[PDB]
């Protein structure tokens, strides 16, 4: 329609005295393709509030606007679009043609300063094209050539960074797709946590990217044995932003299967469309080993005695004494517990390592314990004054 | 005419890079500060001009009162090029700045160049205008480029501080014609009716 004709002309009137980028023919072209209010391409500040309605296949005219765009606004504004806009269109062929013609510090750097690539708002094409090429071969070709150029991007971020997290979220988006195609869900679990923390403040806070991310958070939480099991799921509003059905209900069954321990819950917790992956076959017994063990630690704890026996663990895990020392020692070697197991006397000594999150039960209890320490020191302190 | 303290408040916000002046208007204010510097320094034997940037960089100060233009012109290139303009907290920075001037007999005056209108409410400017009026602080407002897309939001700030031209409350409106930048504020009653140019 005339939305791009009337609004951009008023904005360009301030952005330039005599508009070089206003062509009566080019303004009529945008109306012929997109007749709706949402346009795939625009200029000035209108393009920030209006994204591609369906697919941006008409961007060929957006590249020609750059020649007359310099006299209006500096080239920092067109880097966030184009190459980064074609990623949403799922076409790497038209984007690759502009990657080699620009590269880094060739055509983009003459009089222009360094905005630290394209992470947010305006920026240059120095470090952004190197990041787009890393994700170009990652989502198309194999992962061999993707990591070779990813290490130069990772070493650049660690050597040089900026104040906002806009660059980190763009960097975590590259690694999020790298560990997704691999068989390691432990590194993919920690990678998705850093991507989710920086996604909420800025850099595409819309729910379009959160639906595809929540699907990966459910797979990384069930399979990943690294950080707790369900503990991190309650911290971030993951299940609150998605529905409870269409294979998203299995996250709720994780808390009920680990606390209760019914064998029928684990068999129905994951069906054959998922559990066919061999990773779960090895981690099937690694999910319930930590929760059943940490539950017995806080139960037996009175004052100085955290000690456990084999019969207490054999009732919770429903396994003989051979599997008790196998599963617990694996969690101890990872650094979760400092204790050990005595096979002769049938005693298990466990120290205090795990911070034991999800508080509020012991806050009222530990408050009176600090009063006991405050009273003993005060009573012994007054006795040292007289004598 | 007499000794006075001039504080220049620029606008680093996103609309300050527009084409009201050729090339980039963000680089246009480089000549605006230089024009005021050469006009005020040649009028009186001892005069200093301050610089305060309150848009997008937080209420910081690029350069305070000084007799040298070297560090003033250099700090304009590397400062924040985009942000949000807030005139409520920016004018309060120049109020405490006037106590740091050279001579206590200098007239208190604040010159602010407003590019784009602020998004904050105009109720804060009512109490802010009464604060500068009790201390006899001259307010110089230059509104250009924001009159086309919006009405002037500082008119209520001038109405409360309203005083005859011999004291305070100097409001200016620059005509959006094909005129040079340093010639817009030259014809305006800023450097006019002084001792020397």
Curated annotation (Swiss-Prot), chain A:
Source species: Saccharomyces cerevisiae (strain ATCC 204508 / S288c)
Protein name listed in UniProt: 26S proteasome regulatory subunit RPN9
Signal peptide feature range: none
PANTHER family to which the protein is assigned, alphabetical: 26S PROTEASOME NON-ATPASE REGULATORY SUBUNIT 13
Keyword Nucleotide-binding carried by entry: no
Alphabetical GO biological process terms: proteasome assembly; proteasome-mediated ubiquitin-dependent protein catabolic process; ubiquitin-dependent protein catabolic process
Keyword annotations from UniProtKB, A to Z: Proteasome
Entries under PROSITE patterns matching the protein: PCI (PS50250)
Cited function: Acts as a regulatory subunit of the 26S proteasome which is involved in the ATP-dependent degradation of ubiquitinated proteins.
Domain PCI: 187-355
UniProt similarity note: Belongs to the proteasome subunit S11 family.
Record GO terms (molecular function): structural molecule activity
From Swiss-Prot, chain B:
The protein's name in its UniProt record: 26S proteasome regulatory subunit RPN10
Gene Ontology terms for molecular function: K48-linked polyubiquitin modification-dependent protein binding; polyubiquitin modification-dependent protein binding
Any GO BP annotation: proteasome assembly
Transmembrane annotation, as ranges: none
Further information: Present with 17200 molecules/cell in log phase SD medium.
Record note on modification: Ubiquitinated, leading to its degradation. Ubiquitination is promoted by HUL5.
Record-annotated VWFA domain positions: 5-190
Recorded superkingdom: Eukaryota
Complexes and interactors: The 26S proteasome is composed of a core protease, known as the 20S proteasome, capped at one or both ends by the 19S regulatory complex (RC). The RC is composed of at least 18 different subunits in two subcomplexes, the base and the lid, which form the portions proximal and distal to the 20S proteolytic core, respectively.
Cellular component GO terms held in the UniProt record: cytosol; nucleus; proteasome complex; proteasome regulatory particle, base subcomplex
The family this protein is said to belong to: Belongs to the proteasome subunit S5A family.
Disruption phenotype annotation: Cells are viable.
